[PDB]
Symmetry: C3
Amino acid sequence: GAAPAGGEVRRVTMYAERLAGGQMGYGLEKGKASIPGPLIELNEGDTLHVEFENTMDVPVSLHVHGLDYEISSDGTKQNKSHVEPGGTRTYTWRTHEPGRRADGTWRAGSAGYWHYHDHVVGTEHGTGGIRNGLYGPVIVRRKGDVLPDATHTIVFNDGTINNRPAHTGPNFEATVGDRVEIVMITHGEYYHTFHMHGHHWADNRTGMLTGPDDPSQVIDNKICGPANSFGFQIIAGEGVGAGAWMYHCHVQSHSDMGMVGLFLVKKPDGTIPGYDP
Amino acid sequence: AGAAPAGGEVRRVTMYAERLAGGQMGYGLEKGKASIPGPLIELNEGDTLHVEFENTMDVPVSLHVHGLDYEISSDGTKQNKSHVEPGGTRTYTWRTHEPGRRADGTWRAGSAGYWHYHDHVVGTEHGTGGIRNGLYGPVIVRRKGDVLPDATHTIVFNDGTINNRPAHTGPNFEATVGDRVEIVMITHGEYYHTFHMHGHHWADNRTGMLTGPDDPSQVIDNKICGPANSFGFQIIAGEGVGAGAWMYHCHVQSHSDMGMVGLFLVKKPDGTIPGYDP
Amino acid sequence: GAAPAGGEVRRVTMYAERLAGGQMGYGLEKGKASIPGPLIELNEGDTLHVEFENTMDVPVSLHVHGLDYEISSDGTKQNKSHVEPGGTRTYTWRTHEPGRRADGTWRAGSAGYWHYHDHVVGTEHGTGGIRNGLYGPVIVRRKGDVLPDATHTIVFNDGTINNRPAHTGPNFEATVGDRVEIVMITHGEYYHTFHMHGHHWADNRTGMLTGPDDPSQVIDNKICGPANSFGFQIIAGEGVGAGAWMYHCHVQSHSDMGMVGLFLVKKPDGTIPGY
Ligand SMILES: [Cu+2]
Ligand SMILES: [Cu+2]
Ligand SMILES: [Cu+2]
Ligand SMILES: [Cu+2]
Ligand SMILES: [Cu+2]
Ligand SMILES: [Cu+2]
Ligand SMILES: [Cu+2]
Ligand SMILES: [Cu+2]
Ligand SMILES: [Cu+2]
Ligand SMILES: [Cu+2]
Ligand SMILES: [Cu+2]
Ligand SMILES: [Cu+2]
């Protein structure tokens, strides 16, 4: 459907936990941490209280992009908003609709594709926490935004995708016609360029033109550096049909070293033409 | 000097991949006529293009395009078994579509814009050797009513080279003050770049020109780009600046000192370029 | 506070001086050269005459972005538009309003967040001059732009902010409510990603959406590379209140090695909670 107007106050538990291999992740339920962390979804105007527990043995933080938070929810050591080993703390994120200011100018709303990550593990910029996997997607919708059938997050962290061993995807499945949403976050040291075979989107808030008067470049390829976040919705297979549609960083060595995955768009019968496993 | 019409024609073209001097490989429209960059494809939103392809090399090659509609059988990857074995032939079909209102009430963007095609199998199964070797080219898909330029020039930053040329060898392009000049800019390889033109500027959007007083697109003369990025614009040569040898270059400092520079030689109506002196 | 319609003829002297430590800077009076250079503001339509003088022992130039200049003001040795040691030149920049061409298309105005820099020190592309400090900002306003209470310029020159040593800011101060203009320039070899805590803006010309029909992405983070320039206006603390709000390049080793600084937003009473 469509996103309603917001303004609810939401509460959720979140945990930072150690995972295998010196990795670390956020999770909504203890023992269910993951990398990327859980996807947060808000309608503009919602407030979200994150009751947060650090189950690790090193201080950790929650720092969000793009949303409204006071300095006590910055999630940084420099204003003592980190969480000590064993400690707990409520982080609050607010968001707002757009509107006219009394000064006659237009105040942008919070709507968009954002992300949260650690800011204190290893360095005062979270270089270790981010590298171990403390990051996840936040989506803030505007009233009237079209809603997807599925959302998939794709995170270029250094030379990996979602901290996975090279050459292991992830793959994402869908049926021709599905309204599929991608969240694309970049973290760490390197720039990249994100490409999707067979698909394309508009380079604006939503990845869809708002109608025939929207001048945004339509693209299938985008450069991004650390902490960028963007998102788009595609119709699976539109104009192209089913198949295993590669997506990859297009920096050539990066695709050859395993920053590749498969958008597996299936016919209505669940098969993928020409896909040999 | 007119306007792109509505599309819908079924077009067909022969294209070859052939070796060139120095281990370079290029696309062509006629045998022994390959160029780096390869030849420019122009479609109008709605055209279907059939590329009757021929590999004239000893090694496999493929043809993968950005942005245009193609089924999985015209992917041009080994993974999808759509490459060309040596001495072989294959018809690649690219389709395009106009914008329109979907059933769900949303708006489908049309295929129009500045795109490109490259190899996907030489060297690695991502075309890393093929792209290095020069197997890349521009595709312009126009929307009904897009202004057409007096000339189109293509500028490809392939790694540390421009159009696989030697350093400090341009290329240079000429125009006359007031010409509507179209630039296609494509990037390939490992490195990010920043493309700058002295004397000129454009809007960062689909066409490179604002649509009217309401278009918020930023106006820029410098643009960060990366591998497989492609954008395009039309400028008016000499606009508010006049004739002269207008340099263009990548703006990463080391890249411009190594020779990623060229000239936009804009001439007065009589043919003179003030102060030019190679 | 709105910008007026342009069209004045303005004049300015500019000097290129050595500074401490093999650095070089532009300045509006002798012995007043700064890194980054002095902020030049113009309205769409203005012409600006820069009487430039090179007080250095090596040739220097002055090249601009985005503005209208003839080839004689290009500011490169290629056109012999460089200034030899001790010498003087007048560089002339012009600007235009938007409006429709005879051929029917829309011509964009000059308004934007631009900059100027050397083109001949060290190499024929100013690599040594830029590395040395020879860059500064230029803002050009469109009639009706809203004006700001303060403009701050932030230049990522390779691994430094404004050629400063690592971990030495700079910091900027405001008061909750203040309407602040940031100018962001990048020079050198590297790409960066600029990021501000607690604040966000629109990725368009002005930094703010024109109204509900602007589709520009709203962001708090932007990739950029050498000779990119952009700007934006924020309402300090808007929706977030006071505090020492960090900015930095978000490339992890850059923030770790000192490409960081603070945006100090004060309560009306002067104080910064938590600082
Ligand atoms: Cu930070
Ligand atoms: Cu990459
Ligand atoms: Cu592709
Ligand atoms: Cu961040
Ligand atoms: Cu590919
Ligand atoms: Cu370059
Ligand atoms: Cu320039
Ligand atoms: Cu490609
Ligand atoms: Cu230059
Ligand atoms: Cu940086
Ligand atoms: Cu932040
Ligand atoms: Cu420059």
